[PDB]
Symmetry: D3
Subunit: 177 residues, 6 copies
C-alpha cells in the first residue's frame, strides 16, 4: 500500500483570515513554529489560500515594508495549489517540483485536513527505502505495445521479439519490487 499525503502531513493545521495583518501572521507563526498558514475561505465556494515564510521574507522583510500595516491578502497565494489526502507521496514531490512550491494545504473536497511541505516529505516519506519510478505503469503498458508490434512484424521467435519482451520484464520486476 502506497504511502499517502495524509499519512505524512502535519495534522495540526492553523488558518488565518486574509484581512489579518502580516504582523498577526508572524506572531502566530512564531508561537507555533509554522512555516505556512492556510488562509480561511470566506464562504463555501471561496478557495483556500496560503501564506508562507518565503512570502513573508521575500515580499515584506526584503523590501523593508511594515508588517503591522501590510495585510495577508497582499502577499498570499489565493487560490493556491492543494493536495488530495490520498495522493501518493512521490506525486506530492512531483507536484511541488513542477509548480515550484514547498508547501500546500491538504484538502478533501472543501474540507481542510492538514498542511504538507517539503520538510514533511524529507522527514517522513519512504522515498529512501521505496523509490517509485514515476509513471512506471505507463512505461510497462507502452513497452508491451512495442513488444507486441515488434513480435507480430518480425516473428514471435525472433531475437528482437525477445529483446522487446525483456524491456517489459525488467520494468515489471522493478514495479513489484
Amino acid at each position: 500500500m502506497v504511502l499517502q499525503a495524509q499519512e505524512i502531513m502535519t495534522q495540526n493545521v492553523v488558518t488565518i483570515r486574509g484581512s489579518a495583518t502580516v504582523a498577526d501572521a508572524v506572531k502566530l507563526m512564531k508561537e507555533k513554529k509554522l512555516r505556512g498558514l492556510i488562509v480561511e475561505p470566506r464562504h463555501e465556494q471561496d478557495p483556500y489560500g496560503i501564506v508562507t515564510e518565503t512570502d513573508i521574507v521575500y515580499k515584506v522583510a526584503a523590501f523593508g515594508h511594515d508588517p503591522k500595516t501590510m495585510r495577508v491578502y497582499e502577499i498570499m497565494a489565493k487560490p493556491c495549489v492543494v493536495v488530495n489526502p490520498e495522493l501518493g507521496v512521490e506525486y506530492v514531490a512531483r507536484l511541488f517540483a513542477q509548480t515550484r512550491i514547498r508547501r500546500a494545504p491538504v484538502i478533501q473536497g472543501k474540507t481542510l485536513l492538514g498542511i504538507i511541505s517539503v520538510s514533511d516529505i524529507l522527514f517522513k516519506s519512504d522515498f529512501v527505502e521505496k523509490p517509485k519510478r514515476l509513471f512506471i505503469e505507463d512505461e510497462i503498458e507502452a513497452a508491451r505495445e512495442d513488444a507486441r508490434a515488434i513480435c507480430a512484424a518480425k516473428g514471435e521467435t525472433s531475437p528482437d521479439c525477445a529483446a522487446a519482451w525483456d524491456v517489459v520484464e525488467e520494468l515489471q520486476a522493478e514495479a513489484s519490487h
Copy 2:
C-alpha cells in the same frame, strides 16, 4: 458569481499516459482540442494533462518522433485542477500564478470538463463585471482599522475611517 463550470468546455477527451504523442496529436486534430486529460489508472491516482504547448515545445521543437515518444514523457501529472464552483476571476488568477493555460475541471474523482484562458477570454464576464480580487478582505481590514481609531481617538473625528468602508462596499455592491 460566474463559475468555472459555466464557462468550461464540456466535451472532454481523455488519453492514457502510455499512448504515443502521435496518438495524442491525432485525437487533438480530429476534435480541435488544445489539451487532453490523462485519466487516473486507479482510485488514488491523480489527473494529468497534456497540452499543445507540451507537444510543440517538447516534441516538435527538437524534431523528435511523435510515433515513438509517449504521452507520459511530456504530460503534467499530477496537474493543477479546477473545482467546478471556483469563481472565474479566481480561475484567471490560479492560471497566472502557476503559469498554465488550461486545466481539467474535477469534482471528487469525476472529470466534468476542461477550462482554458480561451474560455475565460471568450465567455467570462470580466469586461462588464470587473472583480477587484480580495475586495472583501480590504473591507474587513478597513473595519478593523476603524475600531482601532474609535478606541484611540474617540467616537467622532473615527468617523473619517468609517467612510472609507462605505466607498469599498459601494464598489462591491
Copy 3:
C-alpha cells in the same frame, strides 16, 4: 510534400490589427467576435515595430487582478516589439523559436508586410512532424562527422566510421 513545410503554409491567414491606443475592452470585443487568441498591434509608421496582444496577456494582467478592461489600454499589456516569424521559416524552427522565447503565437511578417499569424495551435493541427519527424540540426551533425571522417581516413588510412554520414543522410 517532400519539401520542408513553411510557416506561411500553416499560419492562420486572417489578420485584423488593433491600435496600441485602444481599450482592452475593444480588443476583447474583437477577439470574441472573430474567435482570436492573438491580435496584432498595428505599427504607427513604417519604422515602428509590430506588436501583439494575447489571450494570456488579457487573462493574466487584467482578469486575474480585476482591472477594468474599459479603462486599460492595449499598450499597457501588449508585447512591442514582438517576436516575428518569416513566412518561409521551417515549421520545426517556428516550434523551436516559440519554446526558446516562451511565446505561443507571433505575426508572420514579410519585410514590412503583415501576412498572418502563426500559433502553437497551427503547429499542432497542421504540422507534418508526425509523418516527417526530423531531428533539429541533423544536417550540422553530418557536416561535423563528414570532416571527422576526413581526419580519421587521413590519419588511420583510407582503408579504415564513414557509414555515419550515410545513415544520418537517409534519416
Copy 4:
C-alpha cells in the same frame, strides 16, 4: 540628432560568422582573436534561419560543467532560430526586445542579409537615452487621451482636460 536613433547606427558593424558544425573550440578561438562576445551562425541556405552563439552559452553550458570544447559542436549550445533586429528599429525598442526575450545580443538582419550585431553593450555605450529620454508608448497615451478629450468635450460641453494632449506632446 532629433530623429530616433536606429539599431543600425549603434550596432557593432563587423560580423564574422561560424558554421553550426564547428567545434566550440573553434568558436572560442575566433571569439578570443577578435574580442567577440557573440558569433552569428551562418544559414545553410536561403531559407535557413540565422543563429547565434554567445559568451554566456559557452561559459554556462561548457565551462561550468567541464565539457571539452574540442569535442562539442556549436549546434549543441547555440540558439537557432535566434531573435533578430531590423536595422531601423529604434534603439529603445531594441532595449525592450532584449528585456522581454531575456537576451543581450542579436544579429541585425536586412531581409536575408546580415549587417552587424547589436548588444546591451552597444546600447549602454552608444544610446542617446540620457540626453533624449522618451517613455515607451507615450504616442499611444496621447492617441488614447486625444479621443477621451473628444468624448469629454462631446458630453460635458466644448467649453470644458485637453492640455494633457499638449503637455504629453512636448514630452
Copy 5:
C-alpha cells in the same frame, strides 16, 4: 545596532562530503531535523556547497531516483551563495529574494560559522518591530542633492526649495526612528 545574520543563524551547523550518498544526507537530516547540509570543502581553496530539502525532494523523490546510489555531488549547489556573519538581517532577506534561495551557510573568510534560512529570519528577525527601508541612506543622499540643486536654481526661499528639503526631512525622520 542593526541585528546581524550571525545573531539569528542556526549555530549548530552540520556538514557532509560531496561523495556521500543522498541516503546518508537524508539520514543525517532526519536525525537532527535539518533542512540544509553544508558540503565540506575538500581543501582551503575549495568552495562551500549546500544541499537542501528542496534539492532532495525535487531532484531525487520527484523522479523516483534511488537515494542509496545517487550522490550529494549530483544534487548540491557548489559553489553556493554564502552569507557574511555581519550582514544585516534585512539584507540577508533581500539576498535570498534576489537569488531565490531559502538557505545559506554563514561564512567568515573560509570559516563556516552556521547556516541561515528563511525560517531563521521569520522566527528571529526584528523585521516586525524594526522594518528597515532598503537603501534609505542612498535615498537621503539623493534627495539632498536634489534639494541643493533645486534651491540653487530656484532660490533658497522658494516653495519648491522648501518642498525638496521636506522630502529629506521625512526620509531622515524615518531612518533615526
Copy 6:
C-alpha cells in the same frame, strides 16, 4: 588551478547608490565598463553591483530618464561576490547557477577587481584543460563502492571495482 584573481579585470571603478543612472552611464562610457561596483557605506554594509543589463532592461527599455533615476533603484545589493582564490571552473558554475554575468572579486572587505563571463571566455584555460566538475567526489564515491564490493564478494572478482577508480584518477592526473 587557474584562479579568479588571475583572470579578473583589475581596474575597478566604484559608484555610490545615490548617484544617478546617468552618472553611472557616463563613467561606464568613459572607461568601457559593463559593471560598476557599489561601495559599502560602512563596515557591515555589503557590496553591490550595477550592470549594463540592469541599465538597458530597467531604464532604457521603459524610456525612463536616467538623469532622475538612481543607481539604488536598479542595483543588486547585496550582490554575489567572488573569492580571489576560487577556481575559474567554479566561477563559471556560480554564474550559471545564479544567472549572473559578472561580480566583484572581494577579499575580506577589500575590492580587488571584477570578473565576468567575458573574462572567463577570453582568459580561462577551459579549452585546453577541461575540468570535470566534482571528479574528486566521483573518485571518493568509487572507492567507497569498491570497499563495499570487497567485504561482500571477497578480495578478488572487488578487483573489477578498483579499476573504475584508476580510469578516473588517470582522467584527473
